[PDB]
Scaffold this active site. Structure first.
Site, short mmCIF file in Angstrom:
data_model
loop_
_atom_site.label_atom_id
_atom_site.label_comp_id
_atom_site.label_asym_id
_atom_site.label_seq_id
_atom_site.Cartn_x
_atom_site.Cartn_y
_atom_site.Cartn_z
N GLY A 165 31.11 -10.41 54.58
CA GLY A 165 32.21 -11.23 54.07
C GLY A 165 33.18 -11.71 55.13
O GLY A 165 33.87 -12.71 54.92
N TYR A 172 31.42 -16.16 45.08
CA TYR A 172 32.30 -15.69 44.02
C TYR A 172 32.05 -16.50 42.76
O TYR A 172 32.40 -17.68 42.71
CB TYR A 172 33.80 -15.85 44.42
CG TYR A 172 34.18 -14.98 45.59
CD1 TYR A 172 34.02 -15.43 46.90
CD2 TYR A 172 34.65 -13.69 45.40
CE1 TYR A 172 34.27 -14.60 47.99
CE2 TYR A 172 34.92 -12.85 46.49
CZ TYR A 172 34.73 -13.31 47.78
OH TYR A 172 35.03 -12.51 48.86
N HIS A 183 47.39 -10.97 49.15
CA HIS A 183 46.86 -10.37 50.39
C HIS A 183 46.77 -11.42 51.48
O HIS A 183 46.83 -12.61 51.19
CB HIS A 183 45.43 -9.83 50.16
CG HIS A 183 44.42 -10.91 49.87
ND1 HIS A 183 44.42 -11.58 48.66
CD2 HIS A 183 43.42 -11.40 50.64
CE1 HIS A 183 43.45 -12.47 48.75
NE2 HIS A 183 42.82 -12.40 49.92
N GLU A 185 44.16 -12.01 55.13
CA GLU A 185 42.77 -11.65 55.39
C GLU A 185 42.64 -10.36 56.17
O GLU A 185 43.65 -9.85 56.68
CB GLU A 185 42.02 -12.80 56.07
CG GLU A 185 41.98 -14.08 55.25
CD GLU A 185 41.39 -13.92 53.86
OE1 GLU A 185 40.26 -13.41 53.75
OE2 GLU A 185 42.07 -14.29 52.88
N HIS A 271 48.26 -14.86 50.07
CA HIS A 271 47.81 -15.73 48.99
C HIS A 271 47.29 -14.95 47.77
O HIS A 271 46.83 -13.83 47.88
CB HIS A 271 46.80 -16.81 49.47
CG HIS A 271 45.64 -16.26 50.23
ND1 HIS A 271 45.77 -15.89 51.56
CD2 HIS A 271 44.37 -16.04 49.84
CE1 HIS A 271 44.58 -15.43 51.93
NE2 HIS A 271 43.70 -15.52 50.93
N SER A 283 32.90 -18.22 50.68
CA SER A 283 33.96 -17.80 51.58
C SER A 283 33.45 -17.00 52.80
O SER A 283 32.47 -16.25 52.71
CB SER A 283 34.94 -16.93 50.79
OG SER A 283 36.26 -17.13 51.26
ZN LIG Z 1 41.59 -14.38 50.83
#
Ligand SMILES: [Zn+2]
Ligand SMILES: O=c1[nH]cnc2c(-n3cc(CCN4CCC(c5cccc(Cl)c5)CC4)cn3)nccc12
Ligand SMILES: [Cl-]
Ligand SMILES: [Zn+2]
Length: 349
Positions: A165, A172, A183, A185, A271, A283
């Site tokens: 990831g 997703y 959160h 990254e 975000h 992602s």
């Molecule tokens: Zn994120």
């Protein structure tokens, strides 16, 4: 400082020529101050498509669907995951579109956003999150989430570490009311998010320059969580409503991502958000020369053994040779200016 002073979310429409070099375009959007919002939208040229059709993914397996149980009141909520057994896209689609789980009727987004904050603790939905894989066709070379060609490749190329990831793509599968909590990254890296198909995904972002203000707010509302872990927001359990952010003077902005659009998250850009209905997003994380400093100063989750940790040595030896000795001795007192663009943004300044 004078580029994007409001730190509002910016939208970009690159031409095919601009779009071909991902790393160069990310440097360009930063020269425009996009990074100050903590989030940016990039609408690709109409001629670009990552896949000819999404007709052959019925039997694609979602190894660990998660039922999202939400608890809370007054704009403050904690989301708990319940891992369900493996399901296929076909089965997830039938559930997402059924009368029990489908998107409610609404006129404007403001009505739907109210419906989300009024009903997130009821009828727990299933999020088909963290699916290892990609929907991009092999021949696609522009903005291919599976092979972005960023300085983050040093991790697998030199260190040999593969963080699923982080350096690999994730899929997703969403349904109405599925959420992603507040959160930044892992290692405060950047992220790229492509909405392959389906209903929109709405986002909330706090500018990186105000990120510490959100942390102080979140620490105050969850004191038990703050003692147990020095970076509890990395657990991705904490949901805070825009009205709660407004009440405590935390500056933020909102944006709705539609099918065929990209979202870029910036280092230390907090975000959160939700899915309007059945959809699919891809992602991965990436880096620029600017991230290196955020990486060295990232406050990581201490309470969990399996957490994402990148050795910064290799980035400091290759891109900061002068500071390596000072940083290793613990004398590197570098203070990050969040308004500053990446060094690569110079050709646009
Ligand atoms: Zn994120
Ligand atoms: O739509 C999302 N769903 C789930 N997670 C998202 C997420 N991140 C998840 C990790 C891990 C890191 N980021 N960032 C953005 C969007 C999403
Ligand atoms: Cl489909
Ligand atoms: Zn922790």
């Amino acid at each position: 400082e004078t580029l994007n002073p409001s730190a509002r979310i910016m939208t970009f429409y690159p031409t095919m020529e601009e779009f071909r070099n991902f790393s160069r375009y990310i440097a360009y959007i930063e020269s425009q101050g996009a990074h100050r919002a903590g989030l940016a939208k990039v609408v690709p040229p109409k001629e670009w498509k990552p896949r000819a059709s999404y007709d052959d993914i019925d039997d694609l397996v979602i190894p660990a669907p998660i039922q999202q149980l939400v608890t809370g009141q007054s704009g403050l909520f904690t989301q708990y995951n319940i891992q369900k057994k493996a399901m296929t896209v076909r089965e997830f689609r039938k559930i997402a579109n059924s009368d029990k789980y489908c998107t409610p009727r609404y006129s404007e987004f403001e009505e739907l956003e109210r419906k989300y904050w009024k009903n997130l603790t009821f009828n727990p939905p299933i999020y088909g999150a963290d699916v290892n894989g990609t929907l991009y066709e092999k021949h696609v070379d522009e903005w291919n989430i599976g092979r972005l060609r960023t300085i983050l490749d040093l991790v697998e190329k030199e260190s040999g570490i593969t963080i699923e990831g982080v350096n690999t793509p994730y899929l997703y599968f969403g349904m109405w009311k599925t959420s992603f909590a507040w959160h930044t990254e892992d290692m405060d890296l950047y992220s790229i998010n492509y909405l392959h198909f389906g209903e929109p995904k709405s986002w909330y972002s706090v500018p990186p320059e105000h990120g510490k203000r959100l942390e102080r707010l979140a620490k105050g509302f969850f004191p038990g969580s703050a003692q147990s872990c020095e970076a509890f927001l990395r657990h991705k359990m904490t949901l805070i409503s825009p009205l709660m952010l407004k009440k405590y003077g935390i500056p933020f902005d909102k944006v709705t991502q539609e099918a065929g659009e990209f979202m870029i998250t910036f280092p230390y850009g907090y975000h959160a958000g939700f899915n309007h209905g059945f959809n699919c997003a891809e992602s991965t994380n990436f880096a620029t020369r600017r991230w290196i400093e955020y990486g060295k100063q990232a406050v990581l989750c201490s309470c969990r053994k399996d957490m994402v940790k990148i050795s910064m040595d290799v980035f400091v030896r290759k891109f900061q040779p002068e500071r390596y000795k000072l940083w290793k001795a613990g004398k590197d007192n570098t203070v990050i200016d969040h308004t500053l663009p990446t060094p690569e943004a110079a050709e646009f300044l």
